C-alpha cells in the first residue's frame with residue numbers, strides 16, 4: 001500500500017512512534033518518505049546480498065529473515081515479508097528495536113542524509129493528529 005503523508009503520520013502516532021526515544025513524528029515520516037516513498041511494498045537489494053524491506057527499508061542482515069541472507073541475525077524475529085504489509089504494525093515494532101540500538105535514527109541512511117537537521121516538523125504540517 002502507498003500511504004498518504006498525514007495518513008502515515010496518524011498511523012505511526014497511533015503505534016507509539018511520536019517522540020519515541022525522543023524522535024518526533026516529523027522524523028519518522030521524513031524517513032519513510034525518503035526510504036520508501038511511503039510504499040509498504042518497497043524492496044531494495046544491497047551489494048552485500050542483503051535486502052531492505054518495507055516502508056522503513058529494514059535490512060535482512062540483522063532484523064528480519066528472508067531465507068536468502070546467509071548469516072542473517074533476524075533480531076526482530078520476523079520474516080521480511082511481514083514488513084511489506086499494508087498494516088505497519090510489525091514495521092513499527094521492529095523500528096523501535098532498531099532506534100533503541102545505540103545509533104538512534106542514524107541507522108537509516110536517508111534519514112541521516114535527508115532529514116537530520118532539517119525542519120522535519122514540516123512533514124506533519126496540516127495533518128489532523
Ligand code: NA
Nearest residue numbers: 121122123124
Ligand atoms: Na515538505
